[PDB]
Nucleic acid binder design. Structure first.
Lengths: 88, 44, 102, 62, 76
RNA sequence: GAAGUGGCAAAUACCAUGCUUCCAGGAAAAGCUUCUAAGGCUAUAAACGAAUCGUACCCUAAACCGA
RNA sequence: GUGUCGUAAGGCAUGCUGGAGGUAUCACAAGAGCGAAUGCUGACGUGAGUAACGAUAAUGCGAGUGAAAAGCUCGCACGCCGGAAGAUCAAGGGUUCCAGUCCAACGUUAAUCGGGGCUGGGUGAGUCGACCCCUAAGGCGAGGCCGAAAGGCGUAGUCG
RNA sequence: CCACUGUCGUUGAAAAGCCAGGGGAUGACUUGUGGAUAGGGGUGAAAGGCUAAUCAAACUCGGUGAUAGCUGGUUCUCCC
RNA sequence: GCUUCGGGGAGGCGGCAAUAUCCUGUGAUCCGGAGAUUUCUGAAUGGGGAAACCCACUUACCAUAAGGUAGGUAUCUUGUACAAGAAGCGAACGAGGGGAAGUGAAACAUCUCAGUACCCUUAGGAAAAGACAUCAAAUGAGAUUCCCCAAGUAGCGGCGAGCGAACGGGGAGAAGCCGAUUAAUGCUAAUGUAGAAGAACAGCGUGGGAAAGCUGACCGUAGUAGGUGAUAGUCCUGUAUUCGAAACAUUAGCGUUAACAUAUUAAGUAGGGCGGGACACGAGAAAUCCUGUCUGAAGAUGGGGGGACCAUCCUCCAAGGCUAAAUACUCCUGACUGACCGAUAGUGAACCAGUACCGUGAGGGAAAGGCGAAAAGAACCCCUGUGAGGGGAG
């Protein structure tokens, strides 16, 4: 439907990899739902940034790090991020 | 020299895992006994 | 709960016994009344925030039982009671005299 | 707030919920890119979406 | 299991008693046999795992009387 | 802003699931090709697609089994 | 701590410390008295600043940074491995990977360094692997057989 | 892959190793992965060997606070 | 965390644990009733599986691309390929199917331990048993269960170690029936789950601080509660006392509905042989009960029992089914209590404990409380490496 595509993109990634990729290949890096396929991401980007056409989507699951605090051992959420290529 | 443990994940989950416990009457008694003690780790 | 924010009270126990002030904040069993029970705080300066620091004199919480409502007429410490008004309004009432105001 | 949502038709509650979901994405992007000063819109937007979906269940059941 | 369908006979437990009065756990098994009982009311042989006491009950009550009580009891 | 082709040697890798031998006589099932039983297929192309999970790093080791 | 009293177990008084409780008398009840049990737990001694600092492949010097450099970075030189002590994996592990920053603890020394702390980043597949289709050994196994009960076995199958 | 001899090591670098030699090395070989056999049972080219650093009867829990004509210990004071 | 119905009336967005944006008399936070939402695993139930994963099929709708939304699809049992149930988990107590050994006997085998531990099946608030084919032997009594006696008696017993009644008396509770069943629904009544009001003290001295001291008051159907800067009936929360329910459980009474049940006097039965078991009773002179095996009546002119057995007498009618209470227990909910502990104690666990840690696993299993009344938790300066640590200041 069109009420599940609003929850596919969790937020853009701001890093040296994401900033270097944009300037050279114009590929947006996003943090996506833990259940979003490559098709859902493709259908979420083009609906929600009108005027762009996605060539490909490269997804990956990256695991959260164990960051201990105080007396406890705790881990960060795992998350999924996608590289999406837009038509030049 | 070769020591006693020599881990293997498929072998561990297949002789001590959750589904291995639940497939016998006495394995379910093991799980019930871990739960009555309140253990945070039921099965390996 | 019998003492709210803003009402004038008199402290009846502690180092400020006999002084007056208006209630600034009420916690579960502690009360903070402006003017009295002031403490000297050595505030460590920080640049991330706008607060400067220094040796600051601020009013501290004291136990809610050490203060009493100040009677507006007799100018003396009285207790507080409630009156079930037939019109359908519940108001705090001075224990001694018995008038609606505070 | 709930007062001016209880007398809305089912057609316009579903239609209104859609903007609130789309608005949720805009807050999420703006918050991550540092363009969300007042960080309390996200909470009320989430509650509003919860309120809309509560009403939708009611008007679809009764 | 090793039980009689018509009589409820199943193994009994007991003691092996020797001359020095030593006791060891034993079991007493029913005299269970497989017999094909002719049933005139159905023109068919029904084969039952029955005890020899059960055979005497069919001899006295008839297979039809026993067969309905077996069906009423359950397993048929 | 340069070159980038000749000789020789040469694997346990490839030809080779080959070949020759011997007895101790050498997985299975499916994919695949064909036949029909009850009752769509083959070529030609054009467009579009191929999901999900892993992927860092050690691994004759300071990261595994040995406190 | 001190003084004093009693045959003793022990009592009383009081200086200092302490900061919120204690208990006469007489009865009553005991988790009622510790030096030993190679007793139990914790703390701390002696040995003793002694043995040792984990392959005898090996280090020297110049700069840098730094509170501080034999050990870190860079440089020149020297030495060691090179069917490995070099590379790719599987298993196993799970962030140890990279950068910045810090040096308390950890590192058998020092440490500015680190697989240590902290904060960020990093793993992109129709073709590699898994998943998927198929089956081996071996499991489970509608019905079925057997067995006091629990259960044991087993066909079609279904997993592996 | 083994383990015949010696030195070393014996609060070890190591709860069985190192070093110098030594044996088999196309076979009754070695090895990876998965599976099977379970305690008076298993498995054993047989040493009572091995069965998770445990083996003339594993380990854990329970009967159980087994029993112990044995050993150790048994705590304030005074009077007869 | 959403909605609604109630309560409440000024603060609030759970804790470590603060900060920021804010919310709140248009009644927030908070408390109680109901509802909605409720990812995945797990009986797990669409198939599979190394739990939190992989792979599906099918119906309807939508979209046109590689999908979405809402369902359905396990197995077994009972009814006409269709409906209703069950499954699994979780304290103890009950009933039932199996059933040790250590130990004691100063050895050990009968015996004891003990029908215990354990394993297994299964129920209910209890279960079981229960109305005489029972005792008794008195002048007879009158179901079952539980307690005190009888009584450590009578007995049993390598007559050893030990085991160990009954009759009857005193109590608790009482009930006898042929449906004393189960599940819904609606009225009536009473609870329960939030709550509200709730008296009465001043002065002086000491003191950091008064509740303690001195003097004098007041309330009391409220005086030995917990706090508050030291010990408070009159400062706070409370206490005695009087009371609220929109909503939803719960208990009881009446009525209705639908599921099941509704024997008609009892033959493979009583009795007997053989082998065992239970009876306090170990074959003993062994009655009585149970039954693996083999048999097998009489059937009211009859049959069972009265501890071998016979006669007489007394008593009672098996082979159909039920039945409340007094009794057993605690995962729990409330109120209250303690010559119970107070951090090596008391739970293993006062603390982020069944944790860390150990183990392949079953499993084993710790340590660890206290500033101060209030953080007022030490601004600033000095030595040091912008470190640790300290000295001043406060």
């Amino acid at each position: 439907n069109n009420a599940r595509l609003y929850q596919v993109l969790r937020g853009p990634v701001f890093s040296e990899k994401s900033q270097m990729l944009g300037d050279s290949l114009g590929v947006q890096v996003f943090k996506i739902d833990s259940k979003a396929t490559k098709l859902e991401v493709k259908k979420a980007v083009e609906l929600m940034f009108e005027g762009v056409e996605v060539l490909k989507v490269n997804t990956l699951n990256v695991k959260g790090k164990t960051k201990r605090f105080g007396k406890n051992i705790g881990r960060r959420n795992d998350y999924k991020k996608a590289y999406v290529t837009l038509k030049a | 020299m070769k020591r006693t443990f020599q881990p293997s994940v498929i072998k561990r989950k297949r002789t001590h895992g959750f589904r291995a416990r639940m497939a016998t009457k006495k394995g379910r008694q093991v799980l019930a006994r871990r739960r009555a003690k309140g253990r945070h780790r039921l099965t390996v | 709960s019998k003492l709210r924010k803003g009402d004038t009270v008199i402290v009846i126990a502690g180092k400020d016994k006999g002084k007056q002030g208006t209630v600034q904040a009420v916690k579960n069993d502690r009360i903070k009344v402006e003017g009295i029970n002031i403490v000297t705080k050595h505030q460590k300066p920080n640049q991330a925030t706008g607060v400067e620091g220094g040796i600051l004199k601020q009013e501290a919480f004291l136990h809610i039982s050490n203060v009493a409502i100040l009677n507006a007429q007799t100018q003396k410490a009285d207790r507080i009671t409630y009156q079930f008004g037939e019109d359908g309004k519940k108001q705090r009432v001075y224990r001694s005299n018995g008038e609606v105001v505070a | 707030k709930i007062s001016e949502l209880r007398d809305k038709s089912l057609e316009e509650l579903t239609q209104l919920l859609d903007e609130k979901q789309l608005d949720a994405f805009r807050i999420r992007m703006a918050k991550a890119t540092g363009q969300l000063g007042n960080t309390h819109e996200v909470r009320v937007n989430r509650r509003a979406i919860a309120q809309l979906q509560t009403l939708i269940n009611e008007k679809q059941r009764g | 299991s090793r039980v009689c369908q018509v009589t409820g006979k199943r193994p009994m437990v007991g003691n092996n008693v020797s001359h020095a009065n030593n006791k060891t756990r034993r079991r007493f098994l029913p005299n269970l046999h497989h017999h094909r009982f002719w049933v005139e009311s159905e023109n068919r042989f029904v084969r039952l795992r029955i005890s020899t006491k059960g055979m005497r009950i069919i001899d006295k009550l008839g297979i039809d009387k026993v067969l309905v009580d077996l069906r009423a009891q359950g397993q048929k």
